[PDB]
């Protein structure tokens, strides 16, 4: 098996080009507003035609690049790829070092991970230097709409969890674990919605609300990028759920307990709950679709958010270089 375990490996010279172009494409004003990207936040990756090759060989391409443990688990619980009316989303392999939130979000749109930690360091130097009043208010809203048990002190704790350097090594892990309020900020910095596709099946073992839409609510509307970053969270792990290149969209509903349930939208005040439908479309490109309903025979109508088109130029797109790699390796596959 001569196929690399990841995408960015295929051309590490291009991967490094990307890494180098990443903090360059980050805009930095200094007047109390959060940091963000210039152009690269608009990028988006899309996995390639894997069904074009022979099945003896598709396995080789799959097992290397796709997180079969998480793709299975999400699929197996009617949360991944459940809608026959829409294209398939595949989970890519991220380094699960407690910075895999970022490894995924960068993977979703560059092909590289957060290996130089520009994003992690972005998040870390955001919380600190910029005004974070809006962000705290939201966080201490979800927080006492849950738990019930000192919230003033727990904030400075969340930012040092977002430390650039190694914390107390959890399981010998590299970096400290991230959570819901972190995903909100990263949406804002990227000025781009994030949709997490979370595990719902935890029944036997001796209770999180991570999944859902994360919107750039610190930032105003359609001026932002209104095409989602889609991520999968299964165990303790983030994978980019990258679409490919039906029409492309992600469902805004959940097939659970025999009902179409809306996806949670995070950190929302009472006024924004009434805008919630109108808060999307402004921030996504919502479009109704006759999905097959609860069998018997009733096309049930629900909404979904169309995804973005693969727009990385071959100057900074890695998948295209992988694709060449698998082609030549298949060309030998047909020699013998």
Fraction of residues in H or I helices: 25-40%
SS-derived structural category: alpha+beta
Radius of gyration: 20 Å
User: Which shape, going by the Cα principal axes?
Assistant: globular
Order of helices and strands: HEEHHEHHHHHEEEEEEEHHEEEH
Q: Figure out the total of helices.
A: 11
Annotation, overall tally of beta strands: 13
Number of domains: 1
Order of strands, main sheet, comes to 3-7-6-4-5
Oligomeric state, counting identical vs distinct chains: monomer
Q: What does the largest sheet look like?
A: 5 strands, mixed
Strand content: 5-15%
Distance linking N and C termini: 14 Å
Structure description:
Residues 177-179 are annotated as: Interaction with ubiquitin. This is Tumor necrosis factor alpha-induced protein 3. Belongs to the peptidase C64 family. The chain is of the alpha+beta class and 336 residues long. It has one domain. 31% of the residues lie in helices and 13% in strands. It contains eleven helices and 13 strands. It has helices spanning 12-21, 55-65, 68-75, 100-110, 118-129, 133-142, 154-161, 180-189, 270-274, 276-279, 319-333, and strands spanning 26-27, 36-37, 90-91, 194-196, 212-214, 229-233, 238-242, 249-251, 253-256, 259-262, 289-292, 299-302, 304-306.
């Amino acid at each position: 098996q001569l196929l690399p375990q990841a995408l960015y490996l295929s051309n590490m010279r291009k991967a490094v080009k990307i890494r180098e172009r990443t903090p360059e494409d980050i805009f930095k004003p200094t007047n109390g507003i959060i940091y963000h990207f210039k152009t690269m936040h608009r990028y988006t990756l899309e996995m390639f035609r894997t069904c074009q090759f022979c099945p003896q060989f598709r396995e080789i391409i799959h097992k290397a690049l796709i997180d079969r443990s998480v793709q299975a688990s999400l699929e197996s619980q009617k949360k991944l790829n459940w809608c026959r009316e829409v294209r398939k989303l595949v989970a890519l392999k991220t380094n699960g070092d407690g910075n895999c939130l970022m490894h995924a979000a960068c993977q979703y749109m560059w092909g590289v991970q957060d290996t130089d930690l520009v994003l992690r360091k972005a998040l870390c130097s955001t919380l600190k230097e910029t005004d974070t009043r809006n962000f705290k208010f939201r966080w201490q809203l979800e927080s006492l709409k849950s738990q019930e048990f000192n919230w003033n002190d727990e904030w400075d704790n969340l930012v040092k969890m977002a430390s650039a350097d190694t914390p107390a090594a959890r399981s010998g892990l590299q970096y400290n674990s991230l959570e819901e309020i972190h995903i909100f900020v990263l949406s804002n910095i990227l000025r781009r919605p994030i949709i997490v596709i979370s595990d719902k099946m935890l029944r036997s073992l001796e209770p999180l609300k991570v999944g859902g839409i994360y919107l750039p609510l610190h930032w105003p509307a359609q001026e932002c990028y209104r095409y989602p970053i889609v991520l999968g969270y299964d165990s303790q792990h983030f994978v980019p759920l990258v679409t490919l290149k039906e029409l492309r969209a992600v469902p805004l509903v959940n097939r659970d307990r025999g009902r179409f349930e809306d996806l949670k939208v995070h950190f929302l005040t009472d006024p924004e709950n009434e805008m919630k439908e109108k808060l999307l479309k402004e921030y996504l490109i919502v479009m109704e679709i006759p999905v097959q309903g609860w069998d018997h025979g009733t096309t049930h109508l629900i909404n979904a958010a169309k995804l973005d088109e693969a727009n990385l130029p071959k100057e900074i797109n890695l998948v295209d270089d992988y694709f060449e790699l698998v082609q030549h390796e298949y060309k030998k596959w047909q020699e013998n």
